[PDB]
Amino acid sequence: QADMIVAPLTINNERAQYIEFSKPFKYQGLTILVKKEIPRSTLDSFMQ
Amino acid sequence: LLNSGLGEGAPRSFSARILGMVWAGFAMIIVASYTANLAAFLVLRRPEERITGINDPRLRNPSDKFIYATVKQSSVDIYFRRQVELSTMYRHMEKHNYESAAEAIQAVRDNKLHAFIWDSAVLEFEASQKCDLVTTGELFFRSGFGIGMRKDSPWKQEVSLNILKSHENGFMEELDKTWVRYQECDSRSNAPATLTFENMAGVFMLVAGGIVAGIFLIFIEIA
Amino acid sequence: PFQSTLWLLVGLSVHVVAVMLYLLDRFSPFGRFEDALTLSSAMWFSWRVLLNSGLGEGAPRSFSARILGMVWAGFAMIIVASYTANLAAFLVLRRPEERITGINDPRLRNPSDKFIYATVKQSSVDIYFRRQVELSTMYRHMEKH
Amino acid sequence: YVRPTTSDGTCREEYTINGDPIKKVICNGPDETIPGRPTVPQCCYGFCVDLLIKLAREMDFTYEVHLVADGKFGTQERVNNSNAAAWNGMMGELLSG
Amino acid sequence: WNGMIGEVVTKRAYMAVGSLTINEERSEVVDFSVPFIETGISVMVSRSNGTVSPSAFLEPFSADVWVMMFVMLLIVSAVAVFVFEYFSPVGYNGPSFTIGKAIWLLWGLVFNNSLPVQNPKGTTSKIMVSVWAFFAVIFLASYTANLAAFMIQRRYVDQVSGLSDKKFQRPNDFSPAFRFGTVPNGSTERNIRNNYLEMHSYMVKFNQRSVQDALLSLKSGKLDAFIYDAAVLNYMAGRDEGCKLVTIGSGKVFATTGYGIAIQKDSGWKRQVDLAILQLFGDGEMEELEALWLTGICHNEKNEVMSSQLDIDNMAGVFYMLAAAMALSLITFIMEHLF
Amino acid sequence: TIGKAIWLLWGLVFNNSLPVQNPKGTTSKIMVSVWAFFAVIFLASYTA
Ligand SMILES: N[C@@H](CCC(=O)O)C(=O)O
16 A cells, blocks of 8 residues: 655665665754753842 | 942041052952952853764763663664664663654653654754754764655656756755744853843842831831 | 044044033033133033043033933943953953864874975884874875975 | 083083982983084983983993984885895894894 | 766766766766765855844843833832932922932942932931942943853854845845856856856856865955855865855755766666665765765864954944934923923 | 042042042043043953
């Protein structure tokens, strides 16, 4: 029941060794950054 | 000390002259040191707890208190399978992983997991949509997302030409232009003057406390 | 960092406020003697609020000179606080450029005829560069001269 | 540190900047000013000299220090010689007899 | 068609490499395959269109310090005038004389009290003057520290959200001269020519030859903008001597493509050759060759730009506000003269 | 005039502090303005 996939799947030799693939439309890498937290005070009465 | 005045006289004796000079100098020293500590407090970029770049040293070090979970049963397992360099970490990162994307994205923001290993494709969309995450600059381990068809399908050349012509006219610029919203927060220390009114209000409440204290003082005066 | 035309504009504003203090209250056309009265007093007020001086004799009774003195004192605080900010920005230069890399510099692997990385000829560095196999493409360039 | 002998006697006696006498030894070395290589008797002193004195007082033996000229590359016979065989030149850099 | 691609037609080159971006012409005259590296069309200079940096003086206010300062002036003036200034039952002009002098006294204390004016008699009023002076020096310290700390931050020319701006249609839009061009006989000339006829007709009069000539033109001041390939701009801007000019953004370019290869007739390996590329990502050669050959010199998180002062504006804007207050004082003088 | 002059200059260096008084000569007022300029420049360079 599948003919063509429109999902941005990865391209590897194990997957492309048994099927034909086309050129990618967007080259993006992997990242490991989650989030950042900035320490600050809202009230700020100095004397800290 | 507080630099005020009225205009009615001046100390004639030299003792109060030298004492007033060294006292005014001490006032300049304490106000210049207070301003210097204020600028040193606003210049605190916290240049700490940052990342490395293309490869973090903590990824190769096996730890039990900071598990680097990832999406179970996906393309990251195939990428970790076809490699040979980082093979000693596949056994550690192979266990204790989630097989759902929403569970991982919700877990890394709902205080559950320590970190996640996933491409920036969904990270830039969830970060540019929920306004809760932020992406880095470098993009290590680059990959391409293409479309694969059958070998007996002659339409792959026509669809390929439709993709090429779709990238030559400017339709991809319209899709990426209308599907990538530039929201703010580009760094962890880019706009330090985004509050101010709360920092000034925290002293304003003490000013009001000094006004009530002044009402108590005039209550003592009229007594 | 700023051209002299900026200070010329600051002084031009001093002339605008100086002639403005004379345009507000009614006086008499001078141009007969050398030293005036309301012009010298208005100039002493401009240099008193701008340069932050101190000399007690009265206060501007008109509200026009009151608001003009308030916005003028605010402009003085803006130019002195901005000048101090430019001084701190000039002292915080730290020069975080023209630095090195660390364990290996990228320029050592790329050939450059204008920045020759010379070394001691016929020493232990030639033996270290001879027994290696990693950085072998640079031994021919660094071998001469 | 190689220093020529002053006048026509032995080494120059001096002290350091912390209050400790400095020891100097006799060492024969050439000169870079004259095109030739004459035997110039000078005085050597430094870290390796003090280490050689320490090893000379911790062990009962006699030594004789000498300055080595050029030839510090292990003898790399790369010049196209007139069809002849080579052998170990400087190298390990020890047995110059 | 002529050039190197003709070598594929004359059966004298089974495979060729180099700067060959995948498009419709190369996929039309001959065959293609998968590119190993990505690139695109980019501009050498940053995306700024020659704009002036905004004012950094009214930014910390954000229409809040003036409003809150006015409210604090109203409540401090009122509560401060209805405690000791109103001791005897007087008329309406009584407390007004103390308000007009009180606001000028507080204004004198805020701005380092440039005028001592005078002083009352009550000691509680002197204590309140001392507290207001403490808030004045604290507000001054936070104003100089906040303004300086904001000045140390990034205030250079920021990127805009507009790729195709006025320079891609009408040439007579900016009065000063702004030269721009590219190297003729290439994929960029045919792409821009088929996408922007005005930019091509106005671009043929400004042509380049090589890369060193373009670097000398951008360094001296002859050329303003330089649109070319993304890889040539990453290596050219990367191997800079002073690290002055930078590309648009930090890697966000349009028209994503890549350098691939071209073959004559699909009969040999072909597919396996593509798998060979898929082997590279399996060995990490892209990182070693990328950090070995594709590396530059000016690679040091190019995200902040600082130099000297350009404000030949901010103080001009504050002077414009001074002119607005001058016109307000003029209209106020007319209203005073009418009565 | 020296005893009052040194206290006036000391008052101008440490930011007003005490207005004390003022003479009558206009050139003395100009010199007070220049000394105040050096006072605020020295204060800006001292805080920076
Ligand atoms: N690849 C292009 C040159 C680089 C560019 O596109 O600017 C060509 O062969 O014409």
